Amino acid sequence: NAQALNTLVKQLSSKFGAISSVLNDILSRLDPPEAEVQIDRLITGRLQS
Amino acid sequence: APGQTGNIADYNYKLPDDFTGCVIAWNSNKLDSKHSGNYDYWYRLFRKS
């Protein structure tokens, strides 16, 4: 058990094929119509985890 | 265009991110350019928000 959670949390700092792994970084550097794609990539990866 | 930034977009005319229409353009230099005296066309340049 103690391993599984440490695997889940450490999955938060992965990109899954995006510019960065920080939500408040993609929003502060690109306009939203260019940013929903990256946000969707992160959302799908974090759902799969 | 949706999610586009600039003087016109941030001061004169702002389109939403959920636009479901069409945009049409055609040059009007033949007539609307007037005779070195086209002055009725104006645009805002400064605004608080």
Side-chain angles (χ1 to χ4, degrees), chain A residues 31-33 36, chain B residues 2-4 17:
Chain A
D31 56 338
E36 290 103 9
Chain B
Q4 185 63 255
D17 269 319

Side-chain angles (χ1 to χ4, degrees), chain A residues 11-28:
Chain A
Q11 211 82 2
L12 279 189
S13 67
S14 281
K15 309 178 189 317
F16 305 119
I19 72 167
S20 181
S21 72
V22 173
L23 275 166
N24 268 320
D25 209 305
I26 322 172
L27 293 182
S28 70

Side-chain angles (χ1 to χ4, degrees), chain A residues 19 26 29-39 41, chain B residues 2-3 17:
Chain A
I19 72 167
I26 322 172
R29 182 174 291 172
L30 313 180
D31 56 338
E34 197 93 18
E36 290 103 9
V37 181
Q38 326 301 286
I39 279 178
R41 300 197 206 176
Chain B
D17 269 319

Side-chain angles (χ1 to χ4, degrees), chain B residues 5-44:
Chain B
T5 54
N7 192 67
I8 304 301
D10 310 333
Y11 285 136
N12 305 106
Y13 191 25
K14 186 85 181 97
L15 268 69
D17 269 319
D18 312 326
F19 193 67
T20 50
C22 299
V23 166
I24 306 170
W26 68 102
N27 176 227
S28 73
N29 183 44
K30 150 176 177 168
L31 159 67
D32 291 331
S33 45
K34 283 207 189 218
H35 49 91
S36 194
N38 213 5
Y39 306 132
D40 56 13
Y41 301 132
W42 297 73
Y43 59 103
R44 185 168 305 282

